[model samples]
Target: VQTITVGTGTQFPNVCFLDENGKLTGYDVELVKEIDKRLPGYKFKFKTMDFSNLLVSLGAGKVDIVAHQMEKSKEREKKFLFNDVAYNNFPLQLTVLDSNNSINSTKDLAGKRVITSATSNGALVLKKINEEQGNNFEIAYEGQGSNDTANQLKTGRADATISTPFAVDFQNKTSAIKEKVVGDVLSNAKVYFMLGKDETKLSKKVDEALQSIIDDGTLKKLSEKWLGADYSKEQY
Candidate 1:
């Protein structure tokens, strides 16, 4: 069996740390594990790391693959290779306190107080909103990860925050915040298996294996079982 190292980010409600069973368990985790099963003669050894350092670990060859729910961007594509789109067309959601109201739309958030995890897709969405509507608004620099956003909202520190629909859905199930998600930030940022620059041979094999799993409906089945939804928007 070919043993390969993969790294996951340790953030809750998304790419969470290893579960109590000492095995990786999350939406993304199950996806990779499923992929592992479809590709025989391959055993995956996963390592958990900080979200922001996934790329660093990838570049240093500390990991053969990085499957930590990372968003694909033009910048990231220039540096790393991406597998077939596993999950795609995510909507950015604005989360708020269950009690407070008023912050509804991007226009309503004009000059309003909001917080978002630094460098996250949430923060990027808000920045785009500000630029589009000429809001000149400011997003408070909350640290990365949804937990930080949750704490900031729980403590009355911010009016609202943003994250993907999947993350907001997780919050709705886990947290007391019946906070409604407002507006939509439709995104084409497909999640993929990011690879180091020189790993083309292995990358091609992974791409082929990904297609095999998708064709057999294994990918969709695992996604529905873990994410409680369907991920059928693959590019190919």
Candidate 2:
């Protein structure tokens, strides 16, 4: 059996992160593990790195697959092959300090400081807002991980950050940043697994396997266990 290298990030909480024991464990990790078991003649080994590095590694031929809660994007679609089925649906929301009443929605973000991953769908939402609202907020782009993004809000470096509801829920449990979701949801994005564009064989294999899990309820249970909701539905 040929061993396949799977790349993942240790930055996103609940999605893909190291546990207290320093082992890689999360929704994406577990889902890949189950997929590995079902795909005979192939062994899957995980390699954890920073968020952006996951893509870099995939492009460098260092990894055969990536599962880091990655969202579908036109830019990435041009470079990578995405599986047919999305593993999760991310409902992007504007997160701010619970006590900060002045900034409630994208409209109130003028002159505010916000932080987000430069490569995330949330960044696209921010870009769209800036275009429509005349470049109002100051964006502090961070590549480290969600931890640093949350830290920015806690230390006042950023007044708010766009994130998934699951991420905000995970952060609220910590009380580190004391943030809350205000206003309407900005975007509902589907997260996908990425493979090299040339790896169409692997891509098709992964898509078939992913659909099996989705049909068997494994994907639904994992989504509920980690994201607190079942995003396995074809439509959100």
Candidate 3:
């Protein structure tokens, strides 16, 4: 067996947060621990850093894998390799303040403002609709702040937000005004383990073990235990 460094973030509330004991552990990290059990010839180790720095470290060969809840993208796909398996299905929704009944979904916000990363699944959901219907929903890019997604709606700075349920849950509990998600699913973005660009064999091996883990229901169990709700799926 071989030991591989799994680099990850330590800021997400329960997904990959640092514990009370000041160690890196959570759903994301625990999932890797389980995956380690299934991969007979490979072992996994944890290395913690800022979320933004994970990809950089992976590229420099500082880590063998990245376990943050990362969505697949063309730019990232071009430079890094993502396992074909998605350990969790991160469903996106249109979130607005309880005070704002004017906005219901992405369709309602043609000329309004929404905040999300330009390359994130949230932005793409907004972008796809805009290109189809001649919409021009302004996208705001925030560099920092954990509650920006929810506060942007509560403070009336943004018309709506497209993000996962867990993120909205965190914000609704901590932010000033409560927010709610309305509308059909915006995007069902699946999160995967990111490996090196040329690590095809390793990628395939990860997929093999990951598929088994999904088939056996371990991922779902981990999601509920840490995320505090049910959103992870068993299907591909």
The prediction achieving the highest lDDT against the true structure is: 2
Better of 1 and 2 by TM-score: 2
- Per residue, candidate 3 scores C-alpha lDDT tens digits across 161-236 of 7767776776567657787788889777688989998888888988888788778887677877877565545544
Cα RMSD to native, each candidate?
A: 3.1, 2.5, 3.0
Q: Which residue pairs overlap in candidate 1's backbone?
A: none
Q: Model 1 shows how many backbone clashes?
A: 0
Runs off by more than 4 Å, candidate 3? 127-135, 143-147, 170-176, 232-236
lDDT of 2: 0.81
Report the C-alpha lDDT of model 1 over 105-153, residue by residue, as the tens digit.
Answer: 7787876778876655557767878889886576887764454767778
TM for candidate 2 is 0.89
| Model 1, runs deviating above 4 Å | 99-101, 131-135, 143-147, 230-236
The TM-score ranking, best first, is 2, 1, 3
Backbone clashes in model 3, listed as residue pairs:
none
- Cα lDDT of all candidates, in order? 0.71, 0.81, 0.78
